[PDB]
């Protein structure tokens, strides 16, 4: 399949247009990603906003200027020639009816399958403040591609200069069953099987490990054998340092 | 149907099929020399037995030797003849217990268990957070509209 | 899903349901006739004149009575013995999907020769051959143990049923939550 | 790096140098040390800091760590580390083999306990190589082993 690679330059750029424009919950900042969608690895090296206006009274009313779309994409070619139109990004926590009608706009100048991106300034719950989706039809069918972040050498190192485990893993793992339980109950009363079929595939696949439980305990003992030997090595240094500490005390008594 | 037969072949209908339709099977006078049809009966039986034990390894992990002799249309002495050639030539492998009359698959443990075979359990929850995260937004679309 | 297109009257719906029904008689793949009931078909067609095969064969895969369906049909489809063979697969596949997690509580996968013989209404000799033919068709996987009377079948064919997995999924939620208060708070309060 | 011109003027104003580590010129050494006094012109004395809002600081702290396995650490690196655990068990054994061989030759050649040996700190280097490496190999076989199973039911 394909994967979406979002550079930290793009994630931080979309967060800037939200605060500078004083965008409230009634508006969502829309922008255009730039990159190469030809290969299986989709990387976005550039992002910019657009004068978008949102209307909550009518989902079919949106203000977008196509002149600024083609001009800015042409003027930014002088920087890097690898930047083309692979899709667009927009703000807001949720996908409303106005987002479905604006999907067919950029598809005229886009060759391959466009890429959609949702930027969340609040980042409420779990991970992934920016979720990526693909727009394709047979009815609109959206698929969530794996979201990864990879930058250049100077870009990844520059983040560390500006900033100069097990418990968290168990908390998010427990919340996965709580969030899935609410999705099944709400969908049960919504119908009164296709959506629940995909969740049943993952949920079904000492229950099945009973055959490997005997062989698992034998491997855990071998792991402790290495840990027991390394523990003795650390214990020898404690006695060696205790004798070494006395040599310093013996010099303090004579001198 | 004869090509796909070897997978499901129990050798129960083997004598029945050869009698009704025998174009190349039992009696063949074309492009085959011989003094009788006994060569067609011996040569065809050698192939259906080798393919019979081959699919058992992929289906029956443990089977009684007494039941295996009835499925192979052989005897105690004739069963050990055909299986000895399959293992010696490096085709397949099986378990033969003469005093215990037990025939098993003999699953190799050389894979070091958890050190390798655990790769089947990583794909179980790989689609867990991915499918749920996609349905959270999808369900809210139909609920809001 | 087609809302706007494929204009059809009640005359062609019965002709369309004919090819949809007969496809599932010998079809061993993708659930069973109940999928045709999930779509607005049976409600739009007549309930008799050999259009009721969906209702008769629905419970025939549970109770396992072949005299109810064979008595109401003609000699056209009853002459082929293959039709009676495929009805035995879908009857057992309902119970074989319960081996890991659907209904059963302890979620331990084990099957003997006696328990499966009473559910499929078949003896111990015919049930061993029925499972081998089911895996050979690509519907199932796994192995079979005749020494200890154990049947291990890998989960392949999905199902559209639901509502029985909510309670058993809570078992993983409650049992793992106890370690958050005990083991989870032990490492945090370190 | 930056540059700003001064020429005539820019004086009779606030204090430019006193801000950050200015009033310098010990020997010739500053920055690239091709500059001394003039730099480009007049030693503008650049000061490079950074300030971010509450939303921007919340991102890079949780987002940037090493790579992205995050949100579930259990099964992502479980199969990758367990598959190489068989080879890791054999490689950590060689590290211990060369451990005591250094300490054995260390105390064998010294009957004095003085320094002719230009050994000013001899022991602590080889002692830490037998400690920190041992301290590295055991913790990765324990802390990871706790989440290596965690199966329960």
Instruction: Write a three-state SS string for C32-74.
Output: CCHHHHHCCCHHHCCCCCCCCHHHHHHHHCCCCCCHHHHHHCC
d(CA C126, CA D47): 87
Q: Is D152 part of the contact surface with chain C (CB cutoff 8 Å)?
A: yes
Q: A47 forms bridges with which residues in the sheet?
A: A33
Helical segments of chain A, H only: 8-20, 66-75, 97-101, 153-162, 166-191, 194-204, 210-254
Residue D147: closest CA among A242, C183, C4, B15: C183
DSSP string covering D58-116: HHHHHH-SSSS-TT--TTTTHHHHHHTHHHHHHHHHHHHHHHHHHHHHHHHS-SS-SSS
Instruction: Collect all residues with Cβ–Cβ distance below 8 Å to C80 and sequence separation of at least 6.
Output: none
| Structural domain that includes position B94 | 60-108
Neighbours of A142 (CB within 10 A): 16
Residue C41: closest CA among C23, C22, C18: C18
d(CA B29, CA B24): 9
Q: D94 forms bridges with which residues in the sheet?
A: none
Strands A3-6 and A41-49: what pairing?
Answer: parallel
Tell me the two tokens of residue A134: 């693909």
Nearest to D72 among A8, A15, A173 (CB): A173
C-beta of residue C173 within 8 angstroms of C-beta of residue A181: yes
**Integer-rounded Cα radius of gyration of chain A:** 27
SS3 A213: helix
Nearest to A170 among C158, C165, C184 (CB): C184
Q: Which residues of B touch A181 (CB under 8 A)?
A: none
DSSP string covering chain B: -HHHHHHH--SSSHHHHHHH--SSSS---SS---SSSHHHHHHHHHHHHHHHHHHHHHHEEEEEHHHHHHHTT--HHHHHHHHHHHHHTTS-----BTTTTEEE-----TT-GGGTGGGGTTTTTTTHHHHHHHHHHHHHHHHH-
C-beta of residue C72 within 8 angstroms of C-beta of residue C84: no
Given an 8 Å threshold on Cβ–Cβ distance, is C1 in contact with A139? yes
Q: Is D81 part of the contact surface with chain B (CB cutoff 8 Å)?
A: no
Residue A139: closest CA among C64, C18, B94, B141: B141
d(CA C10, CA D152): 56
From its phi and psi, is residue D27 left (phi > 0), alpha (psi between -120 and 50) or beta?
Answer: left
d(CA A42, CA A49): 20
**Integer-rounded Cα radius of gyration of chain B:** 24
Q: Which residues of A touch B145 (CB under 8 A)?
A: 97
Tell me the two tokens of residue B66: 């007494």
SS3 A36: strand
Q: Is A162 part of the contact surface with chain C (CB cutoff 8 Å)?
A: no
d(CA A69, CA A65): 7
Distance, first Cα to last Cα, chain C: 57
Tell me the two tokens of residue D128: 């830490």
Distance, first Cα to last Cα, chain B: 54
Q: Taking CA A77 as the corner, what is the angle to CA A72 and CA A81, rounded to the nearest 5 degrees?
A: 145
Given an 8 Å threshold on Cβ–Cβ distance, is A199 in contact with B135? yes
d(CA A199, CA C19): 31
Distance from CA of A88 to the nearest CA of B (A): 19
d(CA A86, CA A37): 6
Chain B contact partners (≥3 CB pairs within 8 A): A, C, D
DSSP code, position A26: T
C-beta of residue C143 within 8 angstroms of C-beta of residue C101: no
Cα D113 to the chain's mean position, in Å? 35
DSSP string covering D39-61: TTTT-----------HHHHHHHH
Residue A15: closest CA among A98, A87, A94, A123: A123
d(CA D48, CA D3): 13
Integer angstrom CA distances of residue A187 from A125, A139, A147, B128: 21, 21, 27, 18
d(CA B132, CA A179): 8
Chain A contact partners (≥3 CB pairs within 8 A): B, C, D
A vs C: CB pairs below 8 A: 63
Name the resolution in angstroms. 4.2
* Method used to obtain the model: cryo-EM
d(CA C123, CA A164): 74
Return the CATH number at A115: 3.40.140.10
Distance from CA of C10 to the nearest CA of B (A): 30
Tell me the two tokens of residue A145: 């591609």
DSSP string covering A40-61: SEEEEEEEEE---EE-SS-TT-
d(CA C99, CA C156): 12
C-beta of residue A135 within 8 angstroms of C-beta of residue A103: yes
Q: Is C50 part of the contact surface with chain D (CB cutoff 8 Å)?
A: no
Q: What angle separates helix B38-59 from helix C124-136, to the nearest 10 degrees?
A: 90
Neighbours of D15 (CB within 10 A): 7
DSSP string covering C128-186: HHHHHHHHHTTS---EEETTTTEEE----S-----SSHHHHHHHHHHHHHHHIIIIIHH
Q: Which residues of B touch C155 (CB under 8 A)?
A: none
CA contacts within 13 A on the Cβ side of C4: 1
Closest CA in chain B for residue A173:
B129
Q: Taking CA C59 as the corner, what is the angle to CA C57 and CA C65, rounded to the nearest 5 degrees?
A: 80
Q: Is C171 part of the contact surface with chain D (CB cutoff 8 Å)?
A: yes
d(CA D139, CA D74): 17
d(CA B103, CA A234): 52
d(CA B92, CA B85): 10
| Structural domain that includes position A153 | 1-164
Tell me the two tokens of residue C28: 């061993």
């Amino acid at each position: 399949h394909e994967k979406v690679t979002i550079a930290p330059l793009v994630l931080l750029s979309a967060l800037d247009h939200y605060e500078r424009t004083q965008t409230k919950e009634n508006k969502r900042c829309v922008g255009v990603i730039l990159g190469d969608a030809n290969s299986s690895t989709i990387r976005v090296t550039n992002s910019f906003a657009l004068p978008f206006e949102e209307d909550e009274k009518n989902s079919d009313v949106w203000f977008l200027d196509h002149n600024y779309i083609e001009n800015m994409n042409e003027m930014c070619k002088k920087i890097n020639a690898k930047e083309k139109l692979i899709g667009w990004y927009h703000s807001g926590p949720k996908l409303r009816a106005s987002d479905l009608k604006i999907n067919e706009l950029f598809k005229k100048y886009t060759q391959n399958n466009p890429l959609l991106l949702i930027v969340d300034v609040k980042q409420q719950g779990v991970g992934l403040p920016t979720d990526a989706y693909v727009a394709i039809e047979q009815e609109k069918t959206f698929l969530h591609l794996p979201c990864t972040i990879e930058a250049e050498e100077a870009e990844e190192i520059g983040v560390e200069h500006l900033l100069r485990i097990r418990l968290t893993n168990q908390l998010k793992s427990l919340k996965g069953l709580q969030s899935k339980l609410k999705d099944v109950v709400e969908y049960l009363d919504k119908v009164i099987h296709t959506i629940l079929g995909k969740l049943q595939d993952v949920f079904n696949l000492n229950n099945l490990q009973k055959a490997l439980t005997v062989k698992t305990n034998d491997e855990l003992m071998v792991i402790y054998i290495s840990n027991l030997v390394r523990s003795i090595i650390a214990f020898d240094d404690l006695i060696e340092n205790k004798i070494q500490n006395k040599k310093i005390q013996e010099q303090r008594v004579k001198d | 149907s004869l090509v796909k037969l070897f997978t499901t072949n129990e050798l129960m209908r083997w004598p029945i099929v050869q009698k009704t339709y025998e174009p190349v099977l039992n009696e063949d006078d074309l492009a085959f020399g011989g003094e009788a049809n006994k060569h067609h009966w011996e040569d065809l039986q050698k192939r259906v037995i080798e393919h019979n034990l081959r699919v058992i390894s992929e289906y029956y992990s443990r089977i009684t030797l007494l039941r295996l002799n009835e499925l192979l249309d052989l005897t105690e002495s004739q069963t050990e003849t055909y299986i000895s050639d399959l293992v010696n030539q490096g085709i397949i492998y099986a378990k033969v217990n003469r005093p215990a009359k037990i025939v098993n698959f003999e699953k190799p443990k050389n894979s070091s268990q958890l050190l390798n075979e655990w790769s089947h359990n990583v794909d179980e929850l790989l689609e867990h957070i991915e499918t749920i995260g996609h349905l959270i937004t999808k369900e809210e679309i139909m609920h809001g509209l | 899903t087609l809302e706007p297109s494929t204009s059809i009257t009640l005359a062609e719906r019965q002709q369309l349901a004919y090819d949809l029904s007969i496809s599932a008689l010998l079809g061993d793949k993708i659930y069973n006739f109940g999928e045709l009931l999930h779509h607005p078909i049976m409600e739009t067609i007549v309930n008799d004149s050999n259009y009721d095969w969906l209702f008769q064969l629905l419970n025939a895969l549970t109770v396992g009575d072949f005299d109810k369906f064979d008595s109401l049909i003609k000699v056209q489809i009853s002459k082929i013995p293959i039709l009676a063979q495929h009805e035995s697969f879908l009857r057992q596949k309902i119970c074989l999907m319960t081996l890991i997690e659907t209904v059963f509580v302890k979620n331990i996968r084990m099957l003997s020769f006696e328990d499966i013989s009473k559910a499929t209404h078949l003896p111990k000799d015919n049930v061993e051959h029925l499972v081998m033919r089911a895996i050979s068709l690509g519907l199932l996987k796994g192995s079979i143990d005749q020494v200890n009377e154990l049947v291990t079948i890998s989960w392949v064919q999905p199902r559209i049923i639901s509502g029985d997995q909510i309670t058993k999924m809570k078992d993983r939620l409650v049992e793992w939550n106890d370690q958050v208060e005990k083991l989870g708070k032990k490492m945090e309060a370190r | 790096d930056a540059f700003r011109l001064i020429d005539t003027g820019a004086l009779i104003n606030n204090l430019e140098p006193r801000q950050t580590t200015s009033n310098t010129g010990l020997l010739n050494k500053a920055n690239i040390q091709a500059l001394i006094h003039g730099l480009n012109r007049h030693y503008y004395s650049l000061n490079i800091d950074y300030h971010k809002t509450a939303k921007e600081t919340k991102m890079l702290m949780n987002l940037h760590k090493e790579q992205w396995q995050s949100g579930l650490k259990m099964y992502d690196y479980e199969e990758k580390e367990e598959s190489n655990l068989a080879a890791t068990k054999s490689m950590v054994k060689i590290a211990e083999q060369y451990s005591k061989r250094i300490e054995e030759e260390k105390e064998l050649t010294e009957e004095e306990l003085k320094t002719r040996y230009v050994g000013r700190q001899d022991p602590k280097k080889h002692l830490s190589e037998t400690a920190d490496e041992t301290l590295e190999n055991n913790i990765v076989s324990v802390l990871t082993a706790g989440v290596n199973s965690v199966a329960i039911k």
